[PDB]
RNA sequence: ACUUGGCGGAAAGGCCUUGGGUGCUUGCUGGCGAAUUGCAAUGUCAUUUUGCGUGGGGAUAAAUCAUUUGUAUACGACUUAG
RNA sequence: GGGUUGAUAUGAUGCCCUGACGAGUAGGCAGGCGUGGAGGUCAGUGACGAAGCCUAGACCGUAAGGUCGGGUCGAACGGCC
RNA sequence: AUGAAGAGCUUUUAGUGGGCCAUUUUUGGUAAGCAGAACUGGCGAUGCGGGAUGAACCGAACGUAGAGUUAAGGUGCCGGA
RNA sequence: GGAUGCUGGCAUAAUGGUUAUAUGCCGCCCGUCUUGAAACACGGACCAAGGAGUCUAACGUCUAUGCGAGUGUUUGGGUGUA
RNA sequence: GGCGAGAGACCGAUAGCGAACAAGUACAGUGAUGGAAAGAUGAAAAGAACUUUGAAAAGAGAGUGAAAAAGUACGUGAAAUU
């Protein structure tokens, strides 16, 4: 027999070929896996995975985030790439002229960019302009900003947001939460 | 209508039936198998002898815990009985069938009985009263009977199939070499 | 008339019968797994029935094939048959069981004309 | 285990008959100095015999050659083990332990 | 419809078979066979019979004769794995055997319509066997009892054990 | 295949012998024939019983039921008689 | 783990190559078989016999199960998404 | 030095929460197929060859077949040798 | 970097399958709680038909979909082939 | 609930109201109360004239019917069991 030093017939633990039945997304995946297979490009492979990703591993990206990125050095005339959605943010009042490529565009963000004089782009247009990731810049959005990640890992002396419907006095602000009522955590 | 299984010429045959008869299925079955395949007049005579207790019916299948009697010697057994009621119903049927046969116009002495079957009928149920306040069933187990009698025919036939044969060249050559070497 | 196929191996011609399908009439031969705890069939003791498993599966190149080398495909009409027109060397026709005799005659004549095989070409023939 | 000091003939036989490369986590039969120089050309190795030379004239790249070699999947020996009962020492009348140079006989059988 | 369809129908284009690398090299007989040698037929119509060996044909067969004037064996072609070769040796230099061959041993196969109810020979073959057999007997007359050694047949007896026997 | 005379009783059922007839003889020398079962295909050859035939002789009963008995007996059985 | 959109032809969840591995109660996950009814399609089968039932008769599938033939019978029923 | 069969990270949820056997260490006990602990391995959850027979022992862990060689156990016969 | 060539016979129940039976070897009754079940532990005589993790309110993780600092038409109104 | 109307991704005679039928019926119990089972011939009775056996019931024929493999023990007619 075998004295196995592993687990046998185990899956990679990595998503291929998403379980979104969206045919256009599947077309993009056919495209970018061709490109990953042949264009020897890590950018193509990255985009392929990020297309497989789920909704929450595909958070939104605010145009203000994009603006910070373009406020980097050497990164102004670059082409931003977001596998997901791009949201507007009226916490800003200026915006540059660059082009942005992504799956989805909130109408407000699209308006903001077009008004600033850029163009909002799809990933296929990106694949014809910059197959190997010529002069690109990938952005991913926050993941630990999520109101389930508050409760993830809940225990004593972690500061980790119990799971609770109603808030206020007399909802978990007592025994366990102060030294008068016994003990603080 | 629609009798049991028969391999017989229905033209040279007569039939008879009795249905929903208050007589025991087991004893009628044994009577039937006692006259199965017999010549008809011989059978009627045998059953009359039974009713005179000069001969007997053998109980082959439903024979548990019953008594014995020397008459079983005739059949290779010890267990035998004299079921008057079954016998009466049966020879009434045989009367029926002999009449139908002669009306068809048959030999009436080449005759024999080539099918006779008996099977269970709807149970006729009464109530018996048993100790500690209990009811149990007292069920008659009635019978249907159908028989069929037949003319005995001569020997059946001959001339089976041609029995075609397929040979090797070697077997054919063996045959031919022998037919050469000998006469 | 068929296509070159390899030699057909089935690896179990005998039917997998439910345990005690022979013993009790309430237990039918439709195979059914003993999930018990002290079941010598689940435990694979020697001298007990062989349970199905994926090693008894067949070779892909011979799978679904009849002895002729054809795959069976059910037809109810000339249209379903004309679909098989160009795959006679791989596919053969089974006339359905609910078909009438005259439509069977039609289908049979058409299949003869088109060079198509039929594995039940005697349903509802008198003579 | 049964271990011992092996000879050139049995190294050579073991390799030429049971010679297998761990190539990006697969087991490929060797069959070609092309394979060997594709993978182990880094270490001045081109031929299966250069491999064997490192092996037996243990070299600075013995580690990489041996690790490249999938473990030899031997058969049970042909004429038996020589003993009726195995799991004693070679000394006590068994099989395991250091049978320093009869291992060649055993291995040549199992091959 | 009763059955919908298959999506993709496999093609009918038969793949041409690969270029095999099996050559046909001539047969290396055993050194116990040399022409002019006496054989024992084990099988066939003439099973268990001492016979002569003359020629090694091209379809891995051996040309053979009784001779016919002795034991009823005609010219024939047999198989080396279906004959035993004896140690006995008779000279055959002096026979015109180069004429015979596989086309000379042709059958003119039989059709299917020719089904027999229950059940001829070429003057060519007859006179050929006559030529060859007169030469063979003329050489046989040298050593004694050989004519009869052939006329009889071969058999195993109670106590005869082949691996201890020699032929 | 007949034929004479013996022997053998453990399960003999076989062993031996005499007379003559007939056939074969590879003890020796010879002549004729075989083929085609096609390069092998058990290549069919023994005995076990049963049946239907033809022809040759030979022999022309008992038992069971039923009946009766009671030295016996739950019935069967057993014993006796007609 | 890899290869392959290239034009003509079919299926990209496809096809193909290579290597390894395959024990299993409780239990988990997955892919499927089947039943009653629903929307759609087959311009589906059908009184020249639907369904149902019988069939040590045949065929497919590892299997759940499916199909076919023969018999019975008499009014409806299936394939696929 | 050897190996790495990928390394790390998170979420979530089932079942379980009666245990038993062997080697060795070992406590109570006259001792127990007793009771109670320790390391490891096993049975449970596991068929196979061997032990005549057996949950645990020895050997060996299991897709369907074929061929070869062996393990432990054996080679008078039952029974292969 | 995977077997081809030559020849023969059959072309049919011959091979093969199904099935019954025979033969050789193996084969304890299933389900269950159980450390442990063939158990001298429980349920089960047999057959058919019925027969057991569903629906809801409010929630957690996860995954799809839409929109996106907003989202939610559907209490209600308008309108309708209702 | 009562009266009257319409509908259903409902049940389809062991289901669905206990009740598709002479069902709150028969039936039980002092009584309060309890509380069933049971649908289908065939398009149409054309529901089997007449003969014969039998004490008769019934049978065998005949005949009706598309079909008695539809005969009020009636659509088909499984299994256990026979």
Curated annotation (Swiss-Prot), chain A:
N6,N6,N6-trimethyllysine PTM positions: 49
Primary residence: cytoplasm
Coiled coil: none
GO terms for biological process, alphabetical: cytoplasmic translation
Subcellular location: Cytoplasm
Listed GO MF terms: RNA binding; structural constituent of ribosome
Record location of the Glycyl lysine isopeptide (Lys-Gly) (interchain with G-Cter in ubiquitin) cross-link: 115
Keywords: Cytoplasm, Isopeptide bond, Methylation, Ribonucleoprotein, Ribosomal protein, Ubl conjugation
Additional record remark: There are 2 genes for eL18 in yeast.
Record PANTHER family: 60S RIBOSOMAL PROTEIN L18, LARGE RIBOSOMAL SUBUNIT PROTEIN EL18
Function: Component of the ribosome, a large ribonucleoprotein complex responsible for the synthesis of proteins in the cell. The small ribosomal subunit (SSU) binds messenger RNAs (mRNAs) and translates the encoded message by selecting cognate aminoacyl-transfer RNA (tRNA) molecules. The large subunit (LSU) contains the ribosomal catalytic site termed the peptidyl transferase center (PTC), which catalyzes the formation of peptide bonds, thereby polymerizing the amino acids delivered by tRNAs into a polypeptide chain.
Record-stated family: Belongs to the eukaryotic ribosomal protein eL18 family.
Subunit relationships: Component of the large ribosomal subunit (LSU). Mature yeast ribosomes consist of a small (40S) and a large (60S) subunit. The 40S small subunit contains 1 molecule of ribosomal RNA (18S rRNA) and 33 different proteins (encoded by 57 genes). The large 60S subunit contains 3 rRNA molecules (25S, 5.8S and 5S rRNA) and 46 different proteins (encoded by 81 genes). eL18 interacts with NAP1.
From Swiss-Prot, chain B:
Sequence positions bearing Phosphothreonine: 69
GO biological process, one term: cytoplasmic translation
PROSITE patterns assigned to the protein according to its UniProt record, in alphabetical order: RIBOSOMAL_L22
Main subcellular location: cytoplasm
Record's keyword terms, sorted: Cytoplasm, Isopeptide bond, Phosphoprotein, Ribonucleoprotein, Ribosomal protein, Ubl conjugation
InterPro entries, A to Z: Ribosomal_uL22, Ribosomal_uL22_CS, Ribosomal_uL22_euk/arc, Ribosomal_uL22_sf
Keyword Protein biosynthesis: no
Pfam families: Ribosomal_L22
GO cellular component, one term: preribosome, large subunit precursor
Entry function: Component of the ribosome, a large ribonucleoprotein complex responsible for the synthesis of proteins in the cell. The small ribosomal subunit (SSU) binds messenger RNAs (mRNAs) and translates the encoded message by selecting cognate aminoacyl-transfer RNA (tRNA) molecules. The large subunit (LSU) contains the ribosomal catalytic site termed the peptidyl transferase center (PTC), which catalyzes the formation of peptide bonds, thereby polymerizing the amino acids delivered by tRNAs into a polypeptide chain.
Remaining remarks: There are 2 genes for uL22 in yeast.
Record's protein name: Large ribosomal subunit protein uL22A
Gene name in the database record: RPL17A
Curated annotation (Swiss-Prot), chain C:
Subcellular location: Cytoplasm
Gene name per UniProt: RPL32
Natural source organism: Saccharomyces cerevisiae (strain ATCC 204508 / S288c)
Designated name of the protein: Large ribosomal subunit protein eL32
Family, similarity comment: Belongs to the eukaryotic ribosomal protein eL32 family.
GO annotation, biological process: cytoplasmic translation
InterPro entries: Ribosomal_eL32, Ribosomal_eL32_CS, Ribosomal_eL32_sf
A single MF term (Gene Ontology): structural constituent of ribosome
PROSITE patterns the record matches: RIBOSOMAL_L32E
Self-association state and partner proteins as the record states: Component of the large ribosomal subunit (LSU). Mature yeast ribosomes consist of a small (40S) and a large (60S) subunit. The 40S small subunit contains 1 molecule of ribosomal RNA (18S rRNA) and 33 different proteins (encoded by 57 genes). The large 60S subunit contains 3 rRNA molecules (25S, 5.8S and 5S rRNA) and 46 different proteins (encoded by 81 genes).
First-listed, main subcellular location of the protein, grouped into a coarse class: cytoplasm
Domain of life of the source: Eukaryota
Modified residues (Phosphoserine): 39
This protein's GO CC annotations: cytoplasm; cytosol; cytosolic large ribosomal subunit
Keywords carried by this UniProt record: Cytoplasm, Phosphoprotein, Ribonucleoprotein, Ribosomal protein
From Swiss-Prot, chain D:
Described function: Component of the ribosome, a large ribonucleoprotein complex responsible for the synthesis of proteins in the cell. The small ribosomal subunit (SSU) binds messenger RNAs (mRNAs) and translates the encoded message by selecting cognate aminoacyl-transfer RNA (tRNA) molecules. The large subunit (LSU) contains the ribosomal catalytic site termed the peptidyl transferase center (PTC), which catalyzes the formation of peptide bonds, thereby polymerizing the amino acids delivered by tRNAs into a polypeptide chain.
Protein's organism: Saccharomyces cerevisiae (strain ATCC 204508 / S288c)
Record note on quaternary structure: Component of the large ribosomal subunit (LSU). Mature yeast ribosomes consist of a small (40S) and a large (60S) subunit. The 40S small subunit contains 1 molecule of ribosomal RNA (18S rRNA) and 33 different proteins (encoded by 57 genes). The large 60S subunit contains 3 rRNA molecules (25S, 5.8S and 5S rRNA) and 46 different proteins (encoded by 81 genes).
Family of the protein in this entry: Belongs to the universal ribosomal protein uL30 family.
Note from the entry: Present with 101000 molecules/cell in log phase SD medium.
Residues of the full protein shown: 134 to 244 of 244
Record localization: Cytoplasm
Protein name: Large ribosomal subunit protein uL30A
């Amino acid at each position: 027999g075998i004295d196995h030093t592993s687990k046998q017939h185990k899956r990679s633990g990595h998503r291929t070929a998403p379980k979104s039945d969206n045919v256009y997304l599947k077309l993009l995946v056919k495209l970018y896996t061709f490109l990953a297979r042949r264009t020897d490009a890590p950018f193509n492979k990255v985009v392929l995975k990020a297309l497989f990703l789920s909704k929450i591993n595909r958070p939104p990206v605010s145009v203000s985030r994009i603006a910070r990125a373009l406020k980097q050095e050497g990164a102004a005339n670059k082409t931003v790439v977001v596998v997901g959605t791009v949201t507007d943010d009226a916490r800003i009042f200026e915006f540059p002229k660059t082009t942005v490529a992504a799956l989805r565009f909130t109408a407000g963000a699209r308006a903001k960019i077009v008004k600033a004089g850029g163009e909002c782009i799809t990933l296929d247009q990106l694949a014809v302009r910059a197959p190997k990731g010529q002069n690109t810049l990938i952005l991913r959005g926050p993941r630990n900003s999520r109101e389930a990640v508050r409760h993830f890992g809940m225990g004593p002396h972690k500061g980790k947001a119990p799971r609770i419907l109603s808030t206020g006095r007399k909802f978990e602000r007592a025994r366990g939460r102060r030294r008068s009522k016994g003990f603080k955590v | 209508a629609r009798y049991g299984a028969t391999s017989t010429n229905p033209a040279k045959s007569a039939s008879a039936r009795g249905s929903y008869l208050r007589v025991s299925f087991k004893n009628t079955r044994e009577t039937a198998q006692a006259i199965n395949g017999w010549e008809l007049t011989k059978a009627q005579k045998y059953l009359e002898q039974v009713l005179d207790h000069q001969r007997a019916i053998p109980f082959r299948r439903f024979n548990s815990s019953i008594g014995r009697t020397a008459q079983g010697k005739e059949f290779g057994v010890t267990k035998a009985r004299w079921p008057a009621k079954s016998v009466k119903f049966v020879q009434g049927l045989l009367q029926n069938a002999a009449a139908n046969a002669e009306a068809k116009g048959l030999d009436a002495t080449k005759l024999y009985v080539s099918h006779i079957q008996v099977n269970q009928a709807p149970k006729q149920r009464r109530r018996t009263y048993r100790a500690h306040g209990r009811i149990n069933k007292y069920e008659s187990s009635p019978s249907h009977i159908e028989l069929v009698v037949t003319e005995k025919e001569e020997a059946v036939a001959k001339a089976a199939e041609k029995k075609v044969v397929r040979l090797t060249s070697r077997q054919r050559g063996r045959i031919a070499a022998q037919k050469r070497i000998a006469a | 008339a068929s296509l070159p196929h390899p030699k057909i191996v089935k690896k179990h011609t005998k039917k997998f019968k439910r345990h005690h399908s022979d013993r009790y009439h309430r237990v039918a031969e439709n195979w059914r797994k003993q999930k018990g705890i002290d079941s010598v069939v689940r435990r694979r003791f020697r001298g007990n029935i062989s349970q199905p498993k994926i090693g008894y599966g067949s070779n892909k190149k011979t799978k679904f094939l009849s002895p002729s080398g054809h795959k069976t495909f059910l037809v109810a009409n000339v249209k379903d048959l004309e679909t098989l027109t160009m795959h006679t060397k791989t596919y053969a026709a089974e006339i359905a069981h609910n078909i009438s005799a005259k439509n069977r005659v039609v289908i049979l004549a058409r299949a003869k004309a088109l060079g198509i095989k039929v594995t039940n070409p005697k349903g509802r023939l008198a003579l | 285990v049964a271990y011992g000091y092996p000879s050139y003939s049995t190294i050579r036989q073991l390799v030429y008959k049971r010679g297998f490369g761990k190539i990006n986590k697969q087991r490929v039969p060797l069959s070609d100095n092309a394979i060997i120089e594709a993978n182990l050309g880094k270490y001045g190795i081109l031929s299966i015999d250069d491999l064997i030379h490192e092996i037996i004239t243990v070299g600075p790249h013995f580690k990489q050659a041996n690790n490249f070699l999938w473990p030899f999947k031997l058969s049970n020996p042909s004429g038996g083990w020589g003993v009726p009962r195995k799991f004693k020492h070679f000394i006590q009348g068994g099989s395991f332990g250091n049978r320093e140079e009869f291992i060649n006989k055993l291995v040549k059988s199992m091959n | 419809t009763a059955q919908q369809a298959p999506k993709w129908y496999p093609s009918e284009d038969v793949a041409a078979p690969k270029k095999t690398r099996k050559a046909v090299r001539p047969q290396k007989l055993r050194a116990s066979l040399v022409p002019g040698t006496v054989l024992i037929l084990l099988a066939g119509r003439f099973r268990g019979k001492r016979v002569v060996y003359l020629k090694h044909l091209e379809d891995n067969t051996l040309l053979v004769t009784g001779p016919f004037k002795v034991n009823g064996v005609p010219l024939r072609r047999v198989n080396a794995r279906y004959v035993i070769a004896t140690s006995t040796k008779v000279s055959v230099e002096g026979v015109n055997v180069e004429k015979f061959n596989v086309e000379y041993f042709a059958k003119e196969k039989l059709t299917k319509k020719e089904k027999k109810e229950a059940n001829e020979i070429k003057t060519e073959r007859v006179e050929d066997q006559k030529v060859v057999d007169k030469a063979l007997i003329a050489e046989i007359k040298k050593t004694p009892l050989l004519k009869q050694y052939l006329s009889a047949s071969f058999s195993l007896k109670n106590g005869d054990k082949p691996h201890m026997l020699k032929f």
